[PDB]
Amino acid sequence: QDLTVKMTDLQTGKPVGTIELSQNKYGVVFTPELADLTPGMHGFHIHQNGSCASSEKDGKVVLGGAAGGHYDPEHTNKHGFPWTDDNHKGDLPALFVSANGLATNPVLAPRLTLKELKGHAIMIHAGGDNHSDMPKALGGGGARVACGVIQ
Amino acid sequence: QDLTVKMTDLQTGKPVGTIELSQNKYGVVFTPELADLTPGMHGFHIHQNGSCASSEKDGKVVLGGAAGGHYDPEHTNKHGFPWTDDNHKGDLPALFVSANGLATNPVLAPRLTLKELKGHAIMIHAGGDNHSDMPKALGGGGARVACGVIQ
Ligand SMILES: [Cu+2]
Ligand SMILES: [Cu+2]
Ligand SMILES: [Zn+2]
Ligand SMILES: [Zn+2]
């Protein structure tokens, strides 16, 4: 059995679709069926905490902030590619959103297992992801726009 | 060492960029640096023959036709996902082209080895790729728009 995760828009709070997670011999496949997102490539990662709630810093609200940082069980403390080991295991390939706001292209994360995903959050960012902390920390994804908690 | 492949637009014959091929523990990474392509997702596959020349059928010219069909050394005779074994080993993840005609997002083909790629062609299609022969044969990629021969 695969897993289905419901995704929610952090600004309006409305649902934007689902992501199907599937265990394959080469890793976990993420098949999205999302709508209402801005066209373009978006940073897509697994975050530490199983929460999509916001958090605060200096009295400012941070949407999706409760999810914490990137899933990084080996304590690499660095952002990278989905196919490099010295970086966050939660680093997924960027998610493509078409001109009409639809996300339907599946991507593979070869370092992950479906089992370990439970209890973490799937996050989609405003910006893209160049898979590096240079020139922008965490791939330049920026704000969190949509989030979902796995299982 | 990685491999660099030069890509050429089949209609005008001009170069559109390069693709860097790299062997990784999880498969081969294709990092494109292309321009002048139509925005959207494009079918992206490895074809049998090491040629980007055209071919003819019923006296009609078929651009890129000399490359033959999809690389399929196990004779599966079916189009599928980059992470399923019962289909063409030349089936790569779809290539994303931004609003400005640039392709710079890397993708991983976990079933391939850099070694076996030599002598085949990399092809980009007009249409997309749903990784199935349904409802359209070969994922609905259609015409061949850009092509390059590996090594
Ligand atoms: Cu993130
Ligand atoms: Cu093809
Ligand atoms: Zn990361
Ligand atoms: Zn195929």
Characterise B64 by phi-psi region: left (phi > 0), alpha (psi -120 to 50), beta (else): left
Evaluate whether B144 touches A80 at the Cβ level (below 8 Å).
Answer: no
Q: Which residues contact A119 (CB under 8 A, 6 or more apart)?
A: A50, A149, A150, A151
Contacts of B105 in chain A (CB under 8 A): 41, 94, 96
Residue ranges at the known binding site of A: 45, 47, 70, 79, 88, 91, 125
Closest residue in B to A104 (Cα) is B130
CATH fold of B1-151 reads Immunoglobulin-like (2.60.40)
Strand order in the sheet with A107-109: A44-47, A121-125, A144-149, A3-9, A15-24, A27-34, A107-109
B75 is in an annotated binding site: no
B24 touches chain A (CB under 8 A): yes
Evaluate whether B28 touches B19 at the Cβ level (below 8 Å).
Answer: no
Rounded-to-integer distance, Cα B91 and Cα B70, Å: 7
Measure in Å the smallest separation between the Cα of A93 and chain B Cα atoms. 8
With CA atoms as reference, report the closest residue to B49 among B66, B27, B24.
Answer: B66
With CA atoms as reference, report the closest residue to A45 among A22, A13, A16, A68.
Answer: A68
Q: Which residues contact A94 (CB under 8 A, 6 or more apart)?
A: A41, A42, A43, A44, A107, A128, A129, B105
Rounded-to-integer distance, Cα A104 and Cα A123, Å: 16
Evaluate whether A55 touches A100 at the Cβ level (below 8 Å).
Answer: no
Q: For tokens 């292309």, what's the residue?
A: B34
Contacts of B29 in chain A (CB under 8 A): 81, 83
Measure in Å the smallest separation between the Cα of B110 and chain A Cα atoms. 7
Rounded-to-integer distance, Cα B98 and Cα B37, Å: 9
Rounded-to-integer distance, Cα B75 and Cα B86, Å: 9
With CA atoms as reference, report the closest residue to B109 among A110, A30, A137, A1.
Answer: A110
Strand order in the sheet with B121-125: B44-47, B121-125, B144-149, B3-9, B15-24, B27-34, B107-109
Evaluate whether A31 touches A106 at the Cβ level (below 8 Å).
Answer: yes
Chain B interface mutation, best of A26, A85, A114, highest count of B Cβ atoms under 10 Å: A26
Judged by DSSP in three states, A74 sits in coil
Structure tokens at B57: 């059928």
B79 is in an annotated binding site: yes
Chain B interface mutation, best of A2, A83, A87, highest count of B Cβ atoms under 10 Å: A83
Characterise A136 by phi-psi region: left (phi > 0), alpha (psi -120 to 50), beta (else): beta
Rounded-to-integer distance, Cα B27 and Cα B17, Å: 23
Give the ligand at the shortest distance from the Cα of A69.
Answer: 1
B131 is in an annotated binding site: no
Provide the residues around ligand 2 (an ion) whose CB is within 5 A: B 45, 123
With CA atoms as reference, report the closest residue to B77 among B130, B121, B124, B137.
Answer: B137
